[PDB]
Design a protein around this ligand. Structure first.
Ligand code: MGD
Ligand code: MGD
Ligand code: SF4
Ligand code: LCP
Ligand code: MO
Length: 723
C-alpha cells in the first residue's frame, strides 16, 4: 500500500541504443518511480543510468522559456513564443529569399523522436527545397550504413538481440559493450553462463570490463583490425573452415579495385595477409589470429558485435565490410545465433535518422537524393510539385559546420545535440559557430549545454516522456513512449514547434498537416508502405499495447520480422523464391565480399607525436553529461576527465599514477590526471569526453571516411608529458 505510483506509463529509456522498455510511475501528475518494461526485449531490466532517469525528468534545471541573444556575444534573455517563432520564421524565410534554400540547415539527432526528425526532414527537403539536413548519427552509425549497404544492398542488421541467446561465439570488436550497452552485455554474459562452451573474443586496443568475460582479448595496435580480419579469413580459407555451399550460391566477390572477382581471386588477395606478417603488424601473438579465426568458423553459431572502434574511422565502411566477409565466407548468417550485428549507440539513430533518411544524401525508407525515381516517389507522397526535391546532396555534418564558418550556411537549427562539445576538431568548429552573421536556433532542454553559448535563439522543448513519440533502437524494434507528465513552464513538444515554424515561414500548410506525433506517424507509415522498410502494420493502437514491433511489419496481423533475407521469415522474400535466402538489396540476390585494402589512421603517430590517442564512453556518463550530470550518484566515481596511460609506457617515461600530464596533439594541448594501468595496450592513450571543463575534441582531428563522412574520433597521434 502506497504513496507511490497511481499509474505506470509505458515508454523507452532516454539513453542507449539497447533501447530498454521502461514503465514510468506517476502520482498526482508527477513521476515518482521507474522500472523496466517486463514485456520489451530487456525483460524488466534496466542499468543504473536508466534506473536513475526520474531525477532527470524532475530536475528544475531546465530551459523553460524561449530565450534570445540580441547581439553576438550578449546575454540570453527571455522572449515570448510568438516573438521567438516570428523572429525565427522571418530569419529563415529572409535567408532563403536573398541567398536561396542552401543557406539554411537542420542539424538534428538520433535522440530526437522519429516524428520530430520526419517533420524537420520534410520541412527542409520538400518545404524549403534544400537537402541540408543532417545529424549526429553521421558521427556514429554512418559507417555501419555504408558497410551494410555495400555488402547487402540494404541498411540495418539482418538479425536481432534474440540472436544473443543462441550464439556460441561472440566476436566483439571495437565495442565496450559493458559500459556502452550494459543490459545487452548482461545478456551476453548470461549466455556464457547458461552455456559455458560459449567462446567470446573481444578485440579492442583497450582491456575493458568487457574483456573480463572473454576467452581471448586481442589488444591490437590502433588501426590494424582490418589486416587482422583479413588474416582471419586467410586462416578460415587455408584450414577449409569456409562454407562453399553458401558462398557459391549467395555471394559475389569484388576485388581491391572494386571489380567483380571470384573465390580464387579472394584466396590470392588474402595471400597478402598471412598470420605471420599480420601478427607483427597488429602487435599480437600469431596464435590469436588462429584462435579467433577458428572460434569464429568452427563454432555452431557466431555473432559479431561492434561499435565505435570500427565506425569512428577513415577506413570505417571497409572495416564493416570486413566483418561481413567472415560471416559471408562461413555462412554464419541468416540462422538463429549466427549474424553480423552492428551495435547502434543512440536510442533513435536507427528509426529517426537512418530509416527515415534524415541525412543530407538520403530520403525516407531506403530512398536516395541522387536517384530521380526516388525523388519522384517522394514528390508523389509529399504532394509536391515535380522536381521540388533538389537532385544533389546537402552538407554532411563536417561539411555543414565548415559551410557555416564560410557564411554559405547562414541559418541553422540544432535539435537535441550538443555540437560545440561533441564535434571533432573543436577549435575550428568553435570559430565556425561564432560567424558574426550566423543565426543559430537551439532547441535544448538543459541550460548547461556548451552549445547554448553560440545560440542566438533558444526554444524550450518538452523533454523525454513529457510528450509521446517513437524510438527505433539497434535491433529494428520500434517502441512508443507515451506522455507521463506535463512539460514544465512554457515547454512545447517539438513536432508542434516544427509545424508552427514552417507555417510562419511560408511553407505550404498541406506539407505540415500535423496536430501531434500520431498524425506524423501515420504519414510516415504510408511513406514506408511497399518499400523493404515497410512498417505500415505498426498502428499507434498496436504500439500502445505492444512493447515494440520489429520491421518489416507490413500489416496489422503481421507479427514483425526476426530474420531478414530469409525465405519464410522475412515478408520481403517472396514465399515462392527458389532459394532459402534472398539478399534482395543486390540485383542478383547475392551478398558481396569486398577485398578492401587495409591501411590505417588519417593521422598516424610518428617521432614527434609517438602515441595513438583515443576517446571512449564511461558507464556513469551519457555523452555531454547535461542529463547524467544531474544525478548525484553518477559522479561518485567519474566527476572529471582523465587520461589512461599504459603502465609499461608510464614506467619507461617516468609518469606515475594520478600525476598531472599534458596531452598534446597537432591541434591543442590539455592537462589531465593520469590513470596508469594495463587498460591501454602500449603506445596508446585514451580520454573520455563527458567533461565540459575538458573539451577533448579540441585535440582530435577532423578526418572522415570518404564514403560515410564519419569522423575518425577513435585515432589520432599525440604526445604525453609531465605538467
Ligand atoms: N555509458 C554510456 N553508454 C553509451 C553512450 C554514452 O555516452 N555513455 N553513448 C551511446 C552511443 S551514442 C554510442 S555511439 C555507443 C558507443 O559505445 P562503444 O563504441 O562500444 O564505446 P566507445 O568507448 O566509443 O569505444 C568502443 C571501443 O572502441 C575501441 N577502439 C579504439 N581504437 C580502436 C581501433 O583502432 N580498432 C578497434 N576495433 N577498436 C578501437 C576503444 O578502445 C573502445 O573501448 O555507446 C552508447 N551507450
Ligand atoms: N571525442 C569523441 N567525440 C564524440 C564521440 C566519441 O566517441 N569521441 N562519439 C560521437 C557519437 S557516436 C555521438 S552519438 C555524439 C553524441 O553527441 P551529442 O548528441 O552532441 O551529445 P548529447 O549530450 O547526447 O546531446 C544531447 C543534447 O540534447 C539535449 N536534450 C536532452 N533532451 C532534450 C529534448 O527533449 N529536447 C532538446 N531539444 N534537447 C534535449 C541534452 O541536454 C544535450 O545537450 O558524440 C560524438 N562525439
Ligand atoms: S542498457 Fe541503455 S537502454 Fe537499457 S537501461 Fe541502460 S542506458 Fe537505458
Ligand atoms: O546512421 Cl547514419 O549517420 O547513415 O543516419
Ligand atoms: Mo553515437
Amino acid at each position: 500500500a502506497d504513496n507511490r505510483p497511481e499509474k505506470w506509463v509505458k515508454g523507452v529509456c532516454r539513453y542507449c541504443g539497447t533501447g530498454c522498455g521502461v514503465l514510468v510511475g506517476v502520482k498526482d501528475g508527477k513521476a515518482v518511480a521507474i522500472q523496466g518494461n517486463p514485456n520489451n526485449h530487456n525483460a524488466g531490466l534496466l542499468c543504473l543510468k536508466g534506473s536513475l532517469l526520474i531525477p532527470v525528468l524532475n530536475s528544475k534545471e531546465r530551459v523553460t522559456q524561449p530565450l534570445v541573444r540580441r547581439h553576438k556575444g550578449g546575454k540570453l534573455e527571455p522572449v515570448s513564443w510568438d516573438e521567438a517563432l516570428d523572429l525565427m520564421a522571418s530569419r529563415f524565410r529572409s535567408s532563403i529569399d536573398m541567398y536561396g534554400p542552401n543557406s539554411v540547415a537542420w542539424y538534428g539527432s538520433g535522440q530526437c523522436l522519429t516524428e520530430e526528425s520526419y517533420v524537420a526532414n520534410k520541412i527542409f527537403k520538400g518545404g524549403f527545397g534544400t537537402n541540408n539536413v543532417d545529424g549526429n548519427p553521421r558521427l556514429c552509425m554512418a559507417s555501419a550504413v555504408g558497410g551494410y549497404v555495400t555488402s547487402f544492398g540494404k541498411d540495418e542488421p539482418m538479425g536481432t538481440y534474440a540472436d544473443i541467446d543462441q550464439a556460441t561465439c561472440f566476436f566483439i570488436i571495437g565495442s565496450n559493450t559493458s559500459e556502452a550497452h550494459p543490459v545487452l552485455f548482461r545478456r551476453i554474459a548470461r549466455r556464457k553462463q547458461v552455456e559455458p562452451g560459449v567462446k567470446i573474443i573481444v578485440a579492442d586496443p583497450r582491456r575493458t570490463n568487457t574483456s573480463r568475460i572473454a576467452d581471448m582479448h586481442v589488444a591490437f595496435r590502433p588501426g590494424t583490425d582490418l589486416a587482422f580480419m583479413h588474416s582471419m579469413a586467410w586462416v578460415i580459407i587455408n584450414e577449409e573452415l569456409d562454407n562453399p555451399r553458401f558462398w557459391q550460391r549467395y555471394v559475389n566477390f569484388m576485388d581491391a579495385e572494386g571489380k567483380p572477382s571470384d573465390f580464387e581471386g579472394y584466396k590470392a588477395f588474402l595471400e597478402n595477409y598471412r598470420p605471420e606478417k599480420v601478427a607483427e603488424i597488429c602487435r599480437v601473438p600469431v596464435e590469436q589470429i588462429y584462435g579467433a579465426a577458428r572460434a569464429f568458423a568452427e563454432s555452431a553459431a557466431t555473432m559479431s558485435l561492434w561499435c565505435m572502434g570500427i565506425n569512428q574511422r577513415v577506413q570505417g565502411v571497409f572495416a564493416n565490410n570486413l566483418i561481413h566477409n567472415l560471416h559471408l565466407i562461413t555462412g554464419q548468417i541468416c540462422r538463429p545465433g549466427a549474424t553480423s550485428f552492428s551495435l547502434t549507440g543512440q536510442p533513435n539513430a536507427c528509426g529517426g535518422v537512418r530509416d527515415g533518411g534524415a541525412l543530407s544524401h538520403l530520403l525516407p525508407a531506403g530512398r536516395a537524393i541522387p536517384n530521380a525515381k526516388h525523388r519522384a516517389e517522394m514528390e508523389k507522397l509529399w504532394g509536391l510539385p515535380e522536381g521540388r526535391i533538389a537532385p544533389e546532396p546537402g552538407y554532411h555534418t563536417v561539411a555543414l559546420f565548415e559551410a557555416l564558418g564560410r557564411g554559405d550556411v547562414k541559418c541553422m537549427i540544432i535539435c537535441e545535440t550538443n555540437p560545440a562539445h561533441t564535434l571533432p576538431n573543436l577549435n575550428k568548429v568553435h570559430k565556425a559557430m561564432s560567424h558574426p552573421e550566423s543565426f543559430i536556433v537551439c532547441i535544448e532542454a538543459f541550460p548547461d549545454a556548451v552549445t547554448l553559448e553560440y545560440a542566438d535563439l533558444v526554444l524550450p522543448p518538452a523533454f523525454w516522456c513529457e510528450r509521446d513519440g517513437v524510438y527505433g533502437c539497434g535491433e529494428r524494434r520500434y517502441s512508443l513512449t507515451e506522455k507521463a507528465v506535463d512539460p514544465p513552464g512554457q515547454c512545447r513538444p517539438t513536432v508542434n514547434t516544427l509545424v508552427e515554424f514552417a507555417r510562419r515561414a511560408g511553407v505550404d500548410p498541406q506539407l505540415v498537416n500535423f496536430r501531434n506525433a500520431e498524425d506524423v506517424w501515420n504519414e510516415w507509415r504510408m511513406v514506408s508502405k511497399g518499400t523493404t522498410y515497410d512498417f505500415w502494420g505498426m498502428t499507434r493502437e498496436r504500439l500502445r499495447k505492444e512493447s515494440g514491433l520489429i520491421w518489416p511489419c507490413p500489416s496489422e496481423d503481421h507479427p514483425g520480422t526476426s530474420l531478414r533475407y530469409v525465405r519464410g521469415q522475412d515478408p520481403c522474400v517472396p514465399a515462392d523464391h527458389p532459394d532459402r535466402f534472398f539478399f534482395y538489396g543486390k540485383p542478383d540476390g547475392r551478398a558481396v565480399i569486398w577485398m578492401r585494402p587495409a591501411k590505417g589512421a588519417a593521422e598516424e603517430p610518428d617521432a614527434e607525436y609517438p602515441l595513438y590517442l583515443t576517446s571512449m564512453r564511461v558507464i556513469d556518463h551519457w555523452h555531454t553529461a547535461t542529463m547524467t550530470g544531474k544525478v548525484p550518484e553518477l559522479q561518485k566515481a567519474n566527476p572529471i576527465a582523465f587520461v589512461e596511460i599504459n603502465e609499461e609506457d608510464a614506467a619507461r617515461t617516468g609518469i606515475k599514477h594520478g600525476d598531472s600530464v599534458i596531452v598534446e596533439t597537432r591541434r591543442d594541448a590539455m592537462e589531465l590526471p593520469a590513470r596508469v594501468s594495463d587498460v591501454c595496450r602500449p603506445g596508446l592513450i585514451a580520454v573520455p569526453f563527458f567533461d565540459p571543463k575538458k573539451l577533448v575534441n579540441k585535440l582530435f582531428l577532423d578526418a572522415t571516411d570518404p564514403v560515410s563522412r564519419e569522423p575518425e574520433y577513435k585515432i589520432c597521434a599525440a604526445r604525453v608529458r609531465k605538467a
